[PDB]
Design a protein around this ligand. Sequence first.
Ligand SMILES: C=CC[C@@H]1/C=C(\C)C[C@H](C)C[C@H](OC)[C@H]2O[C@@](O)(C(=O)C(=O)N3CCCC[C@H]3C(=O)O[C@H](/C(C)=C/[C@@H]3CC[C@@H](O)[C@H](OC)C3)[C@H](C)[C@@H](O)C/C1=N/NC(C)=O)[C@H](C)C[C@@H]2OC
Length: 111
Amino acid sequence: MGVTKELKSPGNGVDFPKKGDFVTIHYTGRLTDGSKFDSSVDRNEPFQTQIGTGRVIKGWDEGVPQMSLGEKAVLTITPDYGYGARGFPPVIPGNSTLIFEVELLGINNKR
Ligand SMILES: C=CC[C@@H]1/C=C(\C)C[C@H](C)C[C@H](OC)[C@H]2O[C@@](O)(C(=O)C(=O)N3CCCC[C@H]3C(=O)O[C@H](/C(C)=C/[C@@H]3CC[C@@H](O)[C@H](OC)C3)[C@H](C)[C@@H](O)C/C1=N/NC(C)=O)[C@H](C)C[C@@H]2OC
């Protein structure tokens, strides 16, 4: 529904994030017009977040637990599961579909 996932490279197929876990992710975020609005890869800084607890947009909270540890995937996120009608000024317009390349590098202490 609000997020769908295309697998690019498989993870270990065994370890999946659960609600409340902390995950480490490398990502690149783009608009559908091609604009890159952010990239942890470009700043060489893996991004850590608790998953499933609303600290990140819903598309991440729902999509990331579907990935196995080590997986590279692309999340396509509808506005309802992203920043909605307001967007995120100044970088994400209202009603933006978001495209995230995501690599699941760690779950809690597992790498
Ligand atoms: C003072 C606070 C700053 C504080 C910033 C940091 C700790 C730095 C951290 C690395 C954020 C990134 O800095 C390079 C940027 O990430 C993006 O570039 C990105 O790629 C992007 O979309 N994301 C980053 C990677 C994961 C997916 C997604 C995300 O969910 O991000 C969290 C966020 C903005 C949550 C909103 C929470 C509000 C609520 O209304 C909304 O519901 C709809 C959701 C974000 C991790 C938040 O938890 C922490 C912060 N937030 N600023 C807030 C809350 O205003 C977005 C577009 C903008 C972010 O810089 C402003």
